[PDB]
Amino acid sequence: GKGNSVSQTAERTKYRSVRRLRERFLLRRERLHRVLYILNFLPEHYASQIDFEKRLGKFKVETEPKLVWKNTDGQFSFLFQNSFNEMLEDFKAAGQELKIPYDWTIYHLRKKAISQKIEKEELAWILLNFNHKRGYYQLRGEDF
Amino acid sequence: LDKIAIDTNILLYAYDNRDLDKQDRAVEILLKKPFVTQLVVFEFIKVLERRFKMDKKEITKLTIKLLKEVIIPLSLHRDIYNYSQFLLQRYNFGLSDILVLSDSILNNCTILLSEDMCNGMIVDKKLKIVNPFL
Protein backbone atom coordinates (compact mmCIF):
# COMPACT_ATOMS: atom_id res chain seq x y z
CA GLY A 1 0.00 0.00 0.00
CA LYS A 2 2.87 2.37 0.81
CA GLY A 3 5.71 0.54 -0.96
CA ASN A 4 9.01 -0.51 0.62
CA SER A 5 11.19 -2.71 -1.61
CA VAL A 6 8.20 -5.09 -1.80
CA SER A 7 9.68 -7.40 -4.42
CA GLN A 8 11.66 -10.64 -4.41
CA THR A 9 13.39 -9.57 -7.62
CA ALA A 10 14.73 -6.40 -6.00
CA GLU A 11 16.15 -8.36 -3.07
CA ARG A 12 17.82 -10.83 -5.44
CA THR A 13 19.33 -7.94 -7.40
CA LYS A 14 20.61 -6.37 -4.18
CA TYR A 15 22.38 -9.58 -3.21
CA ARG A 16 23.77 -9.92 -6.74
CA SER A 17 25.22 -6.40 -6.66
CA VAL A 18 26.88 -7.05 -3.30
CA ARG A 19 28.41 -10.26 -4.66
CA ARG A 20 29.61 -8.47 -7.79
CA LEU A 21 31.44 -5.80 -5.79
CA ARG A 22 33.08 -8.49 -3.66
CA GLU A 23 34.20 -10.47 -6.70
CA ARG A 24 35.70 -7.43 -8.41
CA PHE A 25 37.65 -6.55 -5.27
CA LEU A 26 39.03 -10.09 -5.18
CA LEU A 27 40.01 -9.85 -8.85
CA ARG A 28 41.88 -6.61 -8.18
CA ARG A 29 43.73 -8.26 -5.30
CA GLU A 30 44.72 -11.24 -7.46
CA ARG A 31 46.04 -8.98 -10.23
CA LEU A 32 48.08 -7.07 -7.65
CA HIS A 33 49.47 -10.38 -6.41
CA ARG A 34 50.52 -11.44 -9.90
CA VAL A 35 52.12 -8.10 -10.76
CA LEU A 36 54.03 -7.87 -7.48
CA TYR A 37 55.24 -11.47 -7.72
CA ILE A 38 56.59 -10.81 -11.21
CA LEU A 39 58.16 -7.60 -9.90
CA ASN A 40 59.71 -9.70 -7.09
CA PHE A 41 58.33 -7.62 -4.21
CA LEU A 42 56.31 -10.08 -2.13
CA PRO A 43 58.09 -11.71 0.83
CA GLU A 44 59.16 -15.26 0.12
CA HIS A 45 57.07 -16.83 2.88
CA TYR A 46 53.99 -14.98 1.64
CA ALA A 47 54.60 -15.70 -2.05
CA SER A 48 55.12 -19.41 -1.35
CA GLN A 49 51.43 -19.92 -0.51
CA ILE A 50 49.94 -18.11 -3.54
CA ASP A 51 49.14 -20.07 -6.70
CA PHE A 52 50.64 -18.54 -9.86
CA GLU A 53 50.13 -21.40 -12.35
CA LYS A 54 46.51 -22.64 -12.44
CA ARG A 55 44.53 -20.48 -9.98
CA LEU A 56 46.47 -17.31 -10.71
CA GLY A 57 47.22 -15.01 -7.78
CA LYS A 58 44.89 -16.89 -5.41
CA PHE A 59 45.91 -18.29 -2.05
CA LYS A 60 46.57 -22.02 -1.95
CA VAL A 61 43.68 -24.08 -0.64
CA GLU A 62 43.28 -24.15 3.15
CA THR A 63 45.74 -21.32 3.77
CA GLU A 64 45.37 -17.85 5.31
CA PRO A 65 48.80 -16.28 4.81
CA LYS A 66 49.68 -12.88 6.24
CA LEU A 67 52.16 -10.72 4.35
CA VAL A 68 53.92 -9.41 7.47
CA TRP A 69 53.59 -12.30 9.96
CA LYS A 70 56.01 -15.16 9.26
CA ASN A 71 55.23 -18.56 10.79
CA THR A 72 58.33 -20.52 11.83
CA ASP A 73 57.74 -23.79 13.70
CA GLY A 74 54.35 -22.62 14.92
CA GLN A 75 55.52 -19.17 16.07
CA PHE A 76 54.45 -15.96 14.32
CA SER A 77 57.00 -13.15 14.07
CA PHE A 78 56.68 -9.64 12.68
CA LEU A 79 58.52 -8.98 9.43
CA PHE A 80 59.42 -5.26 9.59
CA GLN A 81 61.31 -4.87 12.86
CA ASN A 82 63.31 -1.72 12.05
CA SER A 83 60.22 0.14 10.85
CA PHE A 84 58.51 -0.84 14.11
CA ASN A 85 61.48 0.53 16.04
CA GLU A 86 61.29 3.78 14.07
CA MET A 87 57.59 4.09 14.89
CA LEU A 88 58.35 3.44 18.57
CA GLU A 89 61.00 6.17 18.47
CA ASP A 90 58.44 8.57 17.01
CA PHE A 91 55.90 7.61 19.67
CA LYS A 92 58.48 8.13 22.42
CA ALA A 93 59.20 11.57 20.98
CA ALA A 94 55.46 12.25 21.15
CA GLY A 95 55.66 11.01 24.74
CA GLN A 96 52.72 8.59 24.84
CA GLU A 97 53.82 5.00 25.42
CA LEU A 98 56.22 2.33 24.16
CA LYS A 99 53.84 -0.67 23.79
CA ILE A 100 51.72 -0.58 20.62
CA PRO A 101 50.44 -3.18 18.16
CA TYR A 102 52.91 -4.03 15.42
CA ASP A 103 50.37 -3.56 12.61
CA TRP A 104 50.29 0.19 13.28
CA THR A 105 53.59 0.35 11.38
CA ILE A 106 51.58 0.48 8.14
CA TYR A 107 50.67 4.12 8.79
CA HIS A 108 54.22 5.02 9.80
CA LEU A 109 55.45 3.58 6.50
CA ARG A 110 52.71 5.43 4.61
CA LYS A 111 53.94 8.68 6.13
CA LYS A 112 57.58 7.72 5.61
CA ALA A 113 57.24 6.63 1.97
CA ILE A 114 56.31 10.18 0.95
CA SER A 115 59.89 11.40 1.42
CA GLN A 116 62.01 8.35 2.34
CA LYS A 117 62.95 4.96 0.92
CA ILE A 118 61.08 1.92 2.21
CA GLU A 119 61.65 -1.78 1.66
CA LYS A 120 59.87 -3.31 -1.31
CA GLU A 121 57.84 -5.74 0.82
CA GLU A 122 56.65 -2.67 2.72
CA LEU A 123 55.63 -1.11 -0.59
CA ALA A 124 53.62 -4.22 -1.48
CA TRP A 125 51.92 -4.09 1.92
CA ILE A 126 51.09 -0.43 1.32
CA LEU A 127 49.70 -1.12 -2.15
CA LEU A 128 47.44 -3.93 -0.96
CA ASN A 129 46.28 -1.72 1.91
CA PHE A 130 45.32 0.94 -0.64
CA ASN A 131 43.46 -1.68 -2.66
CA HIS A 132 41.44 -2.46 0.46
CA LYS A 133 39.99 1.08 0.75
CA ARG A 134 39.17 2.88 -2.51
CA GLY A 135 36.93 5.76 -1.43
CA TYR A 136 33.89 7.50 -2.87
CA TYR A 137 33.70 8.44 -6.54
CA GLN A 138 30.97 9.28 -9.06
CA LEU A 139 31.34 8.06 -12.62
CA ARG A 140 30.00 11.14 -14.39
CA GLY A 141 32.06 13.69 -12.47
CA GLU A 142 30.92 17.02 -13.94
CA ASP A 143 32.64 19.31 -11.46
CA PHE A 144 29.87 21.61 -10.25
CA LEU B 1 -6.13 -58.15 9.16
CA ASP B 2 -3.82 -60.06 6.79
CA LYS B 3 -0.65 -58.73 5.18
CA ILE B 4 -0.71 -59.41 1.43
CA ALA B 5 2.26 -59.73 -0.92
CA ILE B 6 2.63 -60.23 -4.68
CA ASP B 7 4.96 -61.93 -7.15
CA THR B 8 6.34 -60.75 -10.49
CA ASN B 9 3.59 -62.43 -12.49
CA ILE B 10 0.91 -60.13 -11.04
CA LEU B 11 2.69 -56.98 -12.19
CA LEU B 12 3.50 -58.61 -15.54
CA TYR B 13 -0.16 -59.45 -16.15
CA ALA B 14 -0.89 -55.84 -15.25
CA TYR B 15 1.71 -54.65 -17.76
CA ASP B 16 0.40 -57.00 -20.47
CA ASN B 17 -2.80 -56.12 -22.32
CA ARG B 18 -3.14 -59.18 -24.57
CA ASP B 19 -5.34 -60.64 -21.82
CA LEU B 20 -7.89 -57.98 -20.85
CA ASP B 21 -9.50 -60.00 -18.05
CA LYS B 22 -6.22 -61.01 -16.39
CA GLN B 23 -4.77 -57.51 -16.74
CA ASP B 24 -7.92 -56.16 -15.14
CA ARG B 25 -7.66 -58.63 -12.27
CA ALA B 26 -4.01 -57.77 -11.65
CA VAL B 27 -4.73 -54.03 -11.71
CA GLU B 28 -7.60 -54.71 -9.31
CA ILE B 29 -5.13 -56.25 -6.86
CA LEU B 30 -2.87 -53.21 -7.15
CA LEU B 31 -5.70 -50.94 -5.98
CA LYS B 32 -5.21 -52.45 -2.49
CA LYS B 33 -1.61 -51.22 -2.07
CA PRO B 34 -0.28 -54.78 -1.74
CA PHE B 35 3.15 -55.33 -0.26
CA VAL B 36 5.98 -56.68 -2.40
CA THR B 37 9.53 -57.98 -2.05
CA GLN B 38 12.55 -56.23 -3.55
CA LEU B 39 13.50 -59.43 -5.39
CA VAL B 40 10.14 -59.18 -7.15
CA VAL B 41 11.18 -55.68 -8.25
CA PHE B 42 14.56 -56.84 -9.56
CA GLU B 43 13.06 -59.81 -11.41
CA PHE B 44 10.44 -57.48 -12.89
CA ILE B 45 13.22 -55.21 -14.12
CA LYS B 46 15.06 -58.13 -15.72
CA VAL B 47 11.97 -59.50 -17.47
CA LEU B 48 11.07 -56.01 -18.67
CA GLU B 49 14.52 -55.50 -20.18
CA ARG B 50 14.75 -58.98 -21.75
CA ARG B 51 11.32 -60.00 -23.06
CA PHE B 52 10.01 -56.49 -23.79
CA LYS B 53 13.36 -54.76 -24.51
CA MET B 54 11.93 -51.57 -22.98
CA ASP B 55 14.35 -48.72 -22.41
CA LYS B 56 16.31 -48.55 -19.17
CA LYS B 57 15.04 -45.01 -18.58
CA GLU B 58 11.37 -45.95 -18.99
CA ILE B 59 11.66 -49.09 -16.87
CA THR B 60 13.39 -47.17 -14.08
CA LYS B 61 10.78 -44.41 -14.22
CA LEU B 62 7.92 -46.90 -14.01
CA THR B 63 9.61 -48.77 -11.16
CA ILE B 64 9.94 -45.51 -9.24
CA LYS B 65 6.36 -44.59 -10.07
CA LEU B 66 4.88 -47.85 -8.85
CA LEU B 67 7.07 -48.07 -5.75
CA LYS B 68 6.14 -44.49 -4.88
CA GLU B 69 2.37 -44.57 -5.34
CA VAL B 70 0.89 -48.02 -5.80
CA ILE B 71 2.84 -50.70 -3.99
CA ILE B 72 5.09 -50.90 -0.96
CA PRO B 73 8.56 -52.48 -1.17
CA LEU B 74 9.56 -54.83 1.64
CA SER B 75 12.94 -54.28 3.27
CA LEU B 76 15.30 -57.18 2.60
CA HIS B 77 15.58 -59.40 5.68
CA ARG B 78 19.07 -60.49 6.69
CA ASP B 79 17.69 -63.90 7.75
CA ILE B 80 16.58 -64.70 4.20
CA TYR B 81 19.34 -67.18 3.35
CA ASN B 82 19.24 -69.18 6.58
CA TYR B 83 15.46 -69.45 6.42
CA SER B 84 15.62 -70.41 2.75
CA GLN B 85 17.97 -73.25 3.66
CA PHE B 86 15.47 -74.17 6.38
CA LEU B 87 12.64 -74.15 3.83
CA LEU B 88 14.56 -76.13 1.21
CA GLN B 89 14.57 -79.36 3.22
CA ARG B 90 10.78 -79.41 3.55
CA TYR B 91 10.02 -77.65 0.24
CA ASN B 92 11.18 -78.36 -3.32
CA PHE B 93 10.66 -75.25 -5.46
CA GLY B 94 12.87 -72.98 -7.50
CA LEU B 95 15.43 -71.31 -5.27
CA SER B 96 14.13 -67.98 -6.57
CA ASP B 97 10.58 -68.82 -5.47
CA ILE B 98 11.93 -70.11 -2.16
CA LEU B 99 13.77 -66.82 -1.64
CA VAL B 100 10.63 -64.84 -2.46
CA LEU B 101 8.58 -66.89 0.01
CA SER B 102 11.32 -66.64 2.63
CA ASP B 103 11.40 -62.85 2.47
CA SER B 104 7.60 -62.60 2.35
CA ILE B 105 7.18 -64.74 5.47
CA LEU B 106 10.05 -63.00 7.27
CA ASN B 107 8.06 -59.77 6.82
CA ASN B 108 4.89 -61.33 8.30
CA CYS B 109 3.17 -61.50 4.91
CA THR B 110 -0.02 -63.53 5.32
CA ILE B 111 -1.02 -64.04 1.66
CA LEU B 112 1.19 -64.40 -1.42
CA LEU B 113 -0.36 -63.94 -4.86
CA SER B 114 1.12 -66.03 -7.67
CA GLU B 115 0.33 -68.76 -10.20
CA ASP B 116 3.41 -70.97 -10.67
CA MET B 117 3.75 -71.93 -7.00
CA CYS B 118 1.23 -74.80 -6.54
CA ASN B 119 -1.65 -72.59 -5.40
CA GLY B 120 -3.34 -73.23 -2.06
CA MET B 121 -0.14 -74.62 -0.55
CA ILE B 122 0.77 -73.40 2.94
CA VAL B 123 4.42 -72.58 3.64
CA ASP B 124 5.47 -73.46 7.20
CA LYS B 125 2.01 -72.71 8.63
CA LYS B 126 2.51 -68.96 8.10
CA LEU B 127 1.54 -67.95 4.56
CA LYS B 128 -1.05 -69.42 2.18
CA ILE B 129 -0.54 -68.92 -1.55
CA VAL B 130 -3.59 -67.48 -3.33
CA ASN B 131 -4.14 -67.79 -7.07
CA PRO B 132 -6.34 -64.77 -7.91
CA PHE B 133 -6.91 -65.12 -11.65
CA LEU B 134 -9.00 -68.31 -11.41
Partner: protein
Protein backbone atom coordinates in the same frame (compact mmCIF):
# COMPACT_ATOMS: atom_id res chain seq x y z
CA UNK C 1 48.81 16.51 4.41
CA UNK C 2 47.82 13.19 2.87
CA UNK C 3 45.25 10.98 4.58
CA UNK C 4 47.87 8.47 5.68
CA UNK C 5 49.90 10.96 7.70
CA UNK C 6 46.71 12.53 9.06
CA UNK C 7 45.77 9.12 10.44
CA UNK C 8 49.31 8.60 11.71
CA UNK C 9 49.35 11.88 13.64
CA UNK C 10 45.83 11.44 15.01
CA UNK C 11 47.13 8.08 16.23
CA UNK C 12 50.22 9.66 17.79
CA UNK C 13 48.07 12.15 19.70
CA UNK C 14 45.36 9.74 20.91
CA UNK C 15 46.63 6.13 20.89
CA UNK C 16 43.08 4.94 21.69
CA UNK C 17 41.62 6.29 18.45
CA UNK C 18 39.28 4.17 16.35
CA UNK C 19 40.33 4.52 12.71
CA UNK C 20 38.12 2.23 10.62
CA UNK C 21 34.51 3.32 10.80
CA UNK C 22 35.17 6.19 13.22
CA UNK C 23 37.95 8.53 12.13
CA UNK C 24 37.75 8.20 8.34
CA UNK C 25 34.75 6.36 6.94
CA UNK C 26 34.39 7.62 3.38
CA UNK C 27 36.17 10.37 1.44
CA UNK C 28 36.61 11.39 -2.18
CA UNK C 29 38.81 9.00 -4.14
CA UNK C 30 41.04 11.96 -5.00
CA UNK C 31 42.68 11.82 -1.57
CA UNK C 32 43.65 8.17 -1.93
CA UNK C 33 44.76 8.64 -5.54
CA UNK C 34 46.94 11.62 -4.65
CA UNK C 35 48.56 9.84 -1.71
CA UNK C 36 49.26 6.73 -3.77
CA UNK C 37 50.63 8.79 -6.66
CA UNK C 38 52.97 10.63 -4.31
CA UNK C 39 54.16 7.39 -2.71
CA UNK C 40 54.73 5.64 -6.04
CA UNK C 41 56.52 8.63 -7.56
CA UNK C 42 58.84 8.95 -4.57
CA UNK C 43 59.62 5.22 -4.48
CA UNK C 44 60.24 5.13 -8.24
CA UNK C 45 63.31 7.26 -7.50
CA UNK C 46 64.85 4.47 -5.38
CA UNK C 47 63.81 0.99 -6.59
CA UNK C 48 65.35 0.14 -9.95
CA UNK C 49 62.74 -2.55 -10.63
CA UNK C 50 60.22 0.26 -11.09
CA UNK C 51 62.41 1.57 -13.95
CA UNK C 52 63.03 -1.76 -15.72
CA UNK C 53 61.18 -1.62 -19.03
CA UNK C 54 61.63 -5.40 -19.30
CA UNK C 55 59.70 -5.89 -16.05
CA UNK C 56 56.99 -3.46 -17.18
CA UNK C 57 56.57 -5.43 -20.41
CA UNK C 58 56.55 -8.68 -18.44
CA UNK C 59 53.75 -7.44 -16.19
CA UNK C 60 51.77 -6.17 -19.17
CA UNK C 61 52.02 -9.54 -20.91
CA UNK C 62 51.09 -11.29 -17.66
CA UNK C 63 47.89 -9.28 -17.32
CA UNK C 64 47.05 -8.90 -21.03
CA UNK C 65 48.58 -11.86 -22.86
CA UNK C 66 45.51 -12.07 -25.14
CA UNK C 67 44.84 -8.32 -25.59
CA UNK C 68 47.58 -7.01 -27.87
CA UNK C 69 45.76 -3.69 -28.36
CA UNK C 70 45.69 -2.93 -24.64
CA UNK C 71 49.25 -4.19 -24.28
CA UNK C 72 50.42 -1.71 -26.90
CA UNK C 73 48.43 1.09 -25.28
CA UNK C 74 49.96 0.34 -21.87
CA UNK C 75 53.46 0.08 -23.35
CA UNK C 76 53.48 3.90 -23.56
CA UNK C 77 52.74 4.25 -19.82
CA UNK C 78 54.76 3.41 -16.69
CA UNK C 79 54.30 1.44 -13.47
CA UNK C 80 52.61 4.43 -11.83
CA UNK C 81 49.75 4.40 -14.33
CA UNK C 82 49.53 0.61 -14.16
CA UNK C 83 49.23 0.61 -10.37
CA UNK C 84 46.71 3.43 -9.97
CA UNK C 85 44.82 3.80 -13.23
CA UNK C 86 44.53 0.20 -14.45
CA UNK C 87 44.62 -2.09 -11.41
CA UNK C 88 43.59 -0.40 -8.17
CA UNK C 89 41.44 2.54 -9.30
CA UNK C 90 39.82 1.07 -12.42
CA UNK C 91 36.04 1.55 -12.27
CA UNK C 92 33.95 0.05 -15.05
CA UNK C 93 31.43 2.24 -16.90
CA UNK C 94 27.70 1.61 -16.85
CA UNK C 95 26.29 -1.07 -19.11
CA UNK C 96 24.52 0.12 -22.24
CA UNK C 97 20.74 0.24 -21.90
CA UNK C 98 20.16 1.02 -25.59
CA UNK C 99 19.12 -2.59 -26.21
CA UNK C 100 16.05 -2.07 -23.99
CA UNK C 101 14.75 0.98 -25.87
CA UNK C 102 11.24 0.63 -27.27
CA UNK C 103 10.62 -0.21 -30.92
CA UNK C 104 8.92 1.65 -33.74
CA UNK C 105 5.28 0.75 -34.33
CA UNK C 106 5.60 1.26 -38.10
CA UNK C 107 8.93 0.15 -39.58
CA UNK C 108 10.05 -3.48 -39.40
CA UNK C 109 12.62 -5.58 -41.22
CA UNK C 110 12.42 -9.24 -42.22
CA UNK C 111 15.28 -11.70 -42.55
CA UNK C 112 15.83 -15.44 -42.84
CA UNK C 113 17.88 -17.18 -40.16
CA UNK C 114 19.93 -20.35 -40.33
CA UNK C 115 16.78 -22.29 -39.36
CA UNK C 116 15.15 -21.60 -42.73
CA UNK C 117 12.59 -19.35 -41.03
CA UNK C 118 11.76 -15.72 -41.79
CA UNK C 119 11.51 -13.56 -38.67
CA UNK C 120 11.27 -9.84 -38.02
CA UNK C 121 13.84 -7.45 -36.58
CA UNK C 122 12.55 -4.24 -35.01
CA UNK C 123 13.76 -0.66 -35.43
CA UNK C 124 14.48 1.27 -32.25
CA UNK C 125 12.69 4.53 -31.56
CA UNK C 126 14.25 7.92 -32.19
CA UNK C 127 15.77 9.97 -29.38
CA UNK C 128 13.47 12.95 -28.99
CA UNK C 129 16.50 15.27 -29.00
CA UNK C 130 17.11 14.21 -32.60
CA UNK C 131 16.69 17.15 -35.02
CA UNK C 132 14.32 15.03 -37.12
CA UNK C 133 11.98 14.48 -34.18
CA UNK C 134 12.24 18.17 -33.30
CA UNK C 135 11.13 19.11 -36.82
CA UNK C 136 8.31 16.56 -36.76
CA UNK C 137 7.02 17.93 -33.46
CA UNK C 138 7.34 21.54 -34.63
CA UNK C 139 5.35 20.87 -37.80
CA UNK C 140 2.67 19.06 -35.79
CA UNK C 141 2.33 21.98 -33.38
CA UNK C 142 2.18 24.42 -36.29
CA UNK C 143 -0.67 22.52 -37.93
CA UNK C 144 -2.60 22.20 -34.66
CA UNK C 145 -2.25 25.93 -33.96
CA UNK C 146 -5.30 28.16 -34.39
CA UNK C 147 -6.04 31.59 -32.93
CA UNK C 148 -9.09 33.08 -31.21
CA UNK C 149 -10.20 36.60 -30.31
CA UNK C 150 -10.78 37.49 -26.66
CA UNK C 151 -13.89 39.60 -27.25
CA UNK C 152 -16.29 37.39 -29.22
CA UNK C 153 -14.40 34.06 -29.18
CA UNK C 154 -14.48 33.50 -32.94
CA UNK C 155 -12.13 31.34 -35.02
CA UNK C 156 -10.15 34.37 -36.19
CA UNK C 157 -7.60 32.09 -37.90
CA UNK C 158 -7.57 31.54 -41.68
CA UNK C 159 -6.85 35.28 -41.86
CA UNK C 160 -3.25 35.24 -40.55
CA UNK C 161 -2.16 31.70 -41.58
CA UNK C 162 -3.97 31.22 -44.90
CA UNK C 163 -1.28 31.07 -47.59
CA UNK C 164 1.81 28.87 -47.63
CA UNK C 165 3.90 32.02 -47.17
CA UNK C 166 2.40 32.57 -43.71
CA UNK C 167 3.22 29.00 -42.70
CA UNK C 168 6.76 29.31 -44.05
CA UNK C 169 7.18 32.50 -42.02
CA UNK C 170 5.90 30.80 -38.88
CA UNK C 171 8.23 27.82 -39.37
CA UNK C 172 11.20 30.12 -39.99
CA UNK C 173 10.43 32.04 -36.81
CA UNK C 174 10.00 28.88 -34.74
CA UNK C 175 13.27 27.30 -35.89
CA UNK C 176 15.35 30.18 -34.52
CA UNK C 177 13.90 29.74 -31.01
CA UNK C 178 14.09 27.00 -28.40
CA UNK C 179 10.64 27.63 -26.88
CA UNK C 180 7.52 29.67 -27.60
CA UNK C 181 4.87 31.31 -25.42
CA UNK C 182 1.67 33.33 -25.61
CA UNK C 183 3.39 36.71 -25.88
CA UNK C 184 5.99 35.73 -28.48
CA UNK C 185 3.45 34.01 -30.73
CA UNK C 186 0.92 36.83 -30.50
CA UNK C 187 3.60 39.48 -31.08
CA UNK C 188 4.78 37.57 -34.15
CA UNK C 189 1.56 38.35 -36.01
CA UNK C 190 1.76 41.86 -34.44
CA UNK C 191 -1.17 40.76 -32.25
CA UNK C 192 -1.10 41.48 -28.52
Amino acid sequence: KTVGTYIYETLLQNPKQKIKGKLVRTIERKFYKEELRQILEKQKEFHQELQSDDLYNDCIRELYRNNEVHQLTLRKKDFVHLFMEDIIFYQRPLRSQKSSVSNCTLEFRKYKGENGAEHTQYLKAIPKSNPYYQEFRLWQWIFNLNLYTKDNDENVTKVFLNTTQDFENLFEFLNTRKEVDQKALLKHFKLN
